[PDB]
A paper describes a structure:
Comparisons revealed that states 3 (C_([name])-), 4 (C_([name])- ~ [name]), and 12 (C-CP_L2/L28) were most abundant in the [name] dataset. Unexpectedly, the C_([name])- ~ [name] precursor showed a continuous, well-defined density at the expected uL22 binding site, corresponding to RNA rather than protein. In contrast to most other precursors, H63 of domain IV was not docked in its terminal position. Tentative modeling revealed a non-canonical turn within the root of domain IV, causing [name] to thread through the gap created by the absence of both uL22 and bL32. As a result, the entire domain IV is positioned on the solvent side (back) of the subunit, preventing the docking of the respective helices in their correct positions, which renders this particle a potential dead-end state. Despite this massive misorientation of [name] and the entire domain IV, C_([name])- ~ [name] showed structurally mature domain V helices H90-H93 located next to the PTC. Additional misorientation of domain IV regions was observed in nearly half of these cases, resulting in an overall frequency of 18.1% for the ~[name] states. While certain states exhibit similarities to previously characterized intermediates, surprisingly, nearly half of these precursors lack the early assembly protein uL22. This deficiency induces precursors not observed before, including a 180° misaligned helix ([name]) within the 50S subunit, as a result of [name]-mediated assembly inhibition.
The proline-rich antimicrobial designer peptide [name] inhibits protein expression in bacteria by binding simultaneously to the ribosomal polypeptide exit tunnel and the release factor (RF), depleting the cellular RF pool and leading to ribosomal arrest at stop codons. Separation of cellular extracts derived from cells exposed to [name] in a sucrose gradient reveals elevated levels of partially assembled and not fully matured precursors of the 50S subunit (pre-50S). High-resolution structures obtained by cryogenic electron microscopy demonstrate that a large proportion of pre-50S states are missing up to five proteins (uL22, bL32, uL29, bL23, and uL16) and have misfolded helices in 23S rRNA domain IV. These data suggest a second mechanism for [name], wherein it disrupts 50S subunit assembly by inducing the formation of misfolded precursor particles potentially incapable of evolving into active ribosomes, suggesting a bactericidal mechanism.
Numbering used by the authors:
A (entry chain D): 1 to 126, 161 to 209
B (entry chain N): 1 to 102, 104 to 120
Write the structure that this text describes.
RNA sequence: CCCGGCGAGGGGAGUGAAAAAGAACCUGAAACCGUGUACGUACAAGCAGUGGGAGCACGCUUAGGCGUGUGACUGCGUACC
RNA sequence: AGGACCGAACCGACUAAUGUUGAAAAAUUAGCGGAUGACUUGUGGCUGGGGGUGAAAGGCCAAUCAAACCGGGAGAUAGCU
RNA sequence: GUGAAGAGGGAAACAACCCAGACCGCCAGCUAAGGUCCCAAAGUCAUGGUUAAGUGGGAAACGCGGAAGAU
RNA sequence: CACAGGUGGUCAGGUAGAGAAUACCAAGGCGCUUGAGAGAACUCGGGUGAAUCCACCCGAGACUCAGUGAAAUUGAACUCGCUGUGAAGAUGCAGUGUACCCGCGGCAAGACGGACGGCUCAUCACAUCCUGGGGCUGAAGUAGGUCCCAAGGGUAUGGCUGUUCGCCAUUUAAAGUGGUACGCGAGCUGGGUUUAGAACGUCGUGAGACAGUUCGGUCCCUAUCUGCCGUGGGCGCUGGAGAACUGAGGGGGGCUGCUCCUAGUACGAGAGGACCGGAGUGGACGCAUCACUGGUGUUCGGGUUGUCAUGCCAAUGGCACUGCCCGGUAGCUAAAUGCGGAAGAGAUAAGUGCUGAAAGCAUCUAAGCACGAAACUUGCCCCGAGAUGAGUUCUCCCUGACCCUUUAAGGGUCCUGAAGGAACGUUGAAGACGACGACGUUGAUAGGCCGGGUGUGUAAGCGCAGCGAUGCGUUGAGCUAACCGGUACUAAUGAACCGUGAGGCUUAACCU
């Protein structure tokens, strides 16, 4: 349906009642507010633009400030797009919480791999080329716990990238 | 490697690097002013500021540690008596770097001195 | 005399017919290295030339369509002993 | 007393690598071998080119040997590019 | 007979295949082999025939089949 | 060559040392010929300063490795793929397709780079081999021959023949068959020939050669472009600029063993015996991480042998591989795993099918008309409008003046200098160099500091006991680089350059 954008903070382990250790990743998911709505009539397809975080007004470029003021929302750190599933349509300025993933139990995480120096053929394939600064998508991941008041989301296993990176969580298409 | 790493490559023997750091720290504490490249000035500041902060408190253990890390009786004698009280009320930032113009494209140079350097 | 570093080197004035003769010193072309003049080239495939061919600045019969440098395109085009 | 043993200097290139217009027109590095004996070295001299020398690889004779350099035969040469 | 010692046009290319022996120049017209949908200059010309498989646009012997060909 | 190579004798100290060996010291000699620059004349725009005569530095053009500078080669290069011809794989001949121009880092499909022979894991077919896993061969065993993701390009003995060798015999883990110049004689070598010396003699006017003789022997060079991967400078998408996406096209992988019941059901006289692929459970490989399971972590602590020093001890610093070990911060890895190679869909060979003949039968098809193999494409992860066919969406900015001509996609001057970028500093989980994220006084970007965390282990001093060593309370102490949240204590100041000033021509619809 629609995915949110969060920030990686760290990763640790979680202990269950039965006494089982499961790796988890600390992801802070700020409430993403819709800024622009693209429709078939005008834009040619259905989509919603989501912004997260905040930036100092000094560094915000005037075109970006005007675009944000058009939607009447605070300027964030970036913009992301998600393709709708022909479901309910949102409106500009509609804040989106993390409750959507509270009843899915299956999500996919997309991130950016950490940069690395040139790697040999054996290191990469076991062809030389640039390592890092590339996409990484991991699917079939189940959310462990969801905290609405804390905006903290936990997923089994590790996630791509290092601390401070920006990741995207989407509903698990595979089923 | 390449991730959350502190300190430049500085290709050389570790003992030689430590000796150079000690020599530059001694020169700075003696003359209170040096001219050197920006990486070298930053390394000197990083290696000397802990010593100055430790010297703020006057004690036998602190003096012995300063002597061990400097190997100069005169330098330690100078310390704990003038620099300490001078920067007693200042927490951090005991050294300043001033750009003295130029190489520009080969290796930069700058002056590293104390906050006051006099009085 | 000035710049330059109180050097080297350069720019003036003077001598010198001439310094487009300055001790690297008569006359001074090429292969090679830079700048300026006009043009082609960032959607365009092969011995790179040959004819056609719109323009770009200038001088001409002071237009009446000529020449000084270029060809985007186009038919042909497997160097020499 | 050891053509004795380990082990420095020293001697041999026996093995591997460094380069094949090289650092050198054959040298360098790392091991191996001898290290009181058929040992090595400083200096002086003799054995001379169809020849000398050669514990026989026809090895070496001025960074070259199945016969070295210089000037003359020779501006040589049958065949050939 | 050609090349050897002959240019040029056609066979998509090519030296032995077909026409064809270039004194030079001219923005002229007519032929040979070969073509007249385009690429590329010329009739999408006229009549009588075979062709449903692109055989044309690659094939022996043999009872339309035989028929499998090269990044 | 001031070379890195070679040069005969004497002076021969201390410590732990049997030693002129080993490690540091006495007197003495050195820190090495690449590691590192000034402001480089001049020229432009600026701000600052006593009101002509100007003085200071920035942002630039003008040097750059603080640099002389050689190297085999070179007919001229604007140096693409496939198909066909060709003294025979055509960058150059004919047909077709693709690609913005110029650079940088790696991998060689291959340039016929340049001056016979086999030793060949990377793209190939036979079991290829710089030392992963396998399937079959009534294989008596080992072993050959047949096949996969694949090219040990350093190596046996031999018949046909010349040896490693082109067919193969014994082959073991291969002694091996050609494509690519058998990837390189820009690797090696001769092991037989035309070629290192002998060598019977030859075809052969001769050259040229005899994959014929028995043994054979010394074979040279510092990536030129080109194909692929990644990454840069310029330009264009038509006023400029900042962001976010659709998408023509392109990239790589779809492996495989067991069990639960379903069900000892169907079918089947009995024996026999699934479809079930419903769920879980292993291995090879890909992404990502360090909390867990091992290493490194020459930047952190502790122990210890010799030696020099701090005037001596206690205690430290320098050297002996990081002098030798116990560990170990962060980071980097696997010896650890969360996921992946789906499920499903389309069209499929064979096969399985609803009604149904021509030709009162039959039949997968003639009329209406449906599934389906690990094959193909979507579906899974993507980049991508340099796709010049140059896209879509949102946002920000310029609203001046005058003169001249060859009077129009015209030219010139003063002023303005927008959004955006670059210029410089801090810098990073980005990095060879480019490039990219965040901050620059409207601030945690870097250094240090505060408290915590990890690591290491009981630091020194003090008084007591032991007439030595050593222990006791001080003390779970001292130290801690890269970890966590703040702190402006210090460094990123006021700024300056490019980038504009209403945006070309033709046409259809709105009030003029």
């Amino acid at each position: 349906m629609i995915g949110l954008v969060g920030k990686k903070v760290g990763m640790t382990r979680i202990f269950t009642e039965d006494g089982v250790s499961i790796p988890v990743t600390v992801i802070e998911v700020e409430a993403n507010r819709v800024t622009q709505v693209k429709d078939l009539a005008n834009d040619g397809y259905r989509a919603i633009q989501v912004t997260t975080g905040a930036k100092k007004a000094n560094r915000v470029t005037k075109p970006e400030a005007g675009h944000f003021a058009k939607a009447g929302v605070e300027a964030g750190r970036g913009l992301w797009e998600f393709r709708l599933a022909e479901g309910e349509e949102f409106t500009v300025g509609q804040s989106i919480s993390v409750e959507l993933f509270a009843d899915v139990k299956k999500v996919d995480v997309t991130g950016t791999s950490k940069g690395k120096g040139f790697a040999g053929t054996v290191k990469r394939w076991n062809m030389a080329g640039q390592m890092g600064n590339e996409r990484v998508t991991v699917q079939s991941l189940d959310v462990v716990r969801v905290d609405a008041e804390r905006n903290l989301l936990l997923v089994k296993g590790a996630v791509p990238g290092a601390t401070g990176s920006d990741l995207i969580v989407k509903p698990a298409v595979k089923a | 490697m390449r991730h959350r790493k502190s300190g430049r490559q500085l290709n050389r023997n570790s003992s030689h690097r430590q000796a150079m750091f000690r020599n530059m720290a001694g020169s700075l504490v003696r003359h209170e002013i040096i001219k050197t490249t920006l990486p070298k000035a930053k390394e000197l500041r990083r290696v000397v500021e802990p010593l100055i902060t430790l010297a703020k408190t006057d004690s036998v253990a602190n003096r012995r540690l300063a002597f061990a890390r400097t190997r100069d009786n005169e330098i330690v004698a100078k310390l704990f008596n003038e620099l300490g009280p001078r920067f007693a009320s200042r927490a951090g930032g005991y050294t300043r770097i001033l750009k003295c113009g130029f190489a520009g494209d080969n290796a930069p140079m700058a002056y590293i001195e104390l906050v006051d350097r006099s009085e």
